[PDB]
Specification:
Layout lengths: L2 E3 L17 E4 L2 E9 L6 H10 L3 E8 L1 H12 L5 E5 L5 H14 L3 E2 L16 E8 L4 E6 L1
Parallel strand pairs: 3-4, 3-6, 4-5
Antiparallel strand pairs: 1-8, 2-7, 3-7, 7-8
PDB class: chaperone
Keywords: molecular chaperone, protein folding, chaperone
Assembly: monomeric
């Protein structure tokens, strides 16, 4: 089964499983960010972290756009980074609540704009973990969250 929400990849170029036509990440770390990520400079700490741990990264945020989404995608296409990004589900307080539920499910911490919750201060410990994540055009599924 696995927890599944109605939000798909923010880019088909995150697809790493041709035979499926979808994104499939094994033993991924999951960044839960209740905010819009537009600058990759802010993402570097987490990106360095997952790379050192040798695991791919799923990003679930209010939105991943602009330069951050572009840079992320090109580097994914080039095989330099192992990531997939999707929008958090819901709107208003529902978004926050669902992000927290996913956080609890995966043992992660929801990064935000609040003091001490900055994305640039995020560590491997703030990331949720799951056995596998599957993302297609319409949905994201988190399987066996720690």
């Amino acid at each position: 089964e696995g927890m599944q929400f109605d939000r798909g990849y923010l880019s088909p170029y995150f697809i790493n499983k041709p035979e499926t036509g979808a994104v499939e990440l094994e033993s991924p770390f999951i960044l839960l960010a209740d905010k819009k990520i537009s600058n990759i400079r802010e993402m570097l700490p987490v990106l360095e972290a997952v790379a050192k741990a040798g695991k791919p990264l799923l990003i679930i945020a209010e939105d991943v756009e602009g330069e951050a989404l572009a840079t992320l995608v090109v580097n994914t296409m080039r095989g330099i980074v192992k990531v997939a990004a999707v929008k958090a589900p819901g709107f208003g307080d529902r978004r926050k609540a669902m992000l927290q539920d996913i956080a609890t499910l995966t043992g992660g911490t929801v990064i935000s704009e609040e003091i001490g919750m900055e994305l640039e201060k995020a560590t491997l410990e703030d990331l949720g973990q799951a056995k596998r994540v599957v993302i297609n055009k319409d949905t994201t599924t988190i399987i066996d969250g720690v």
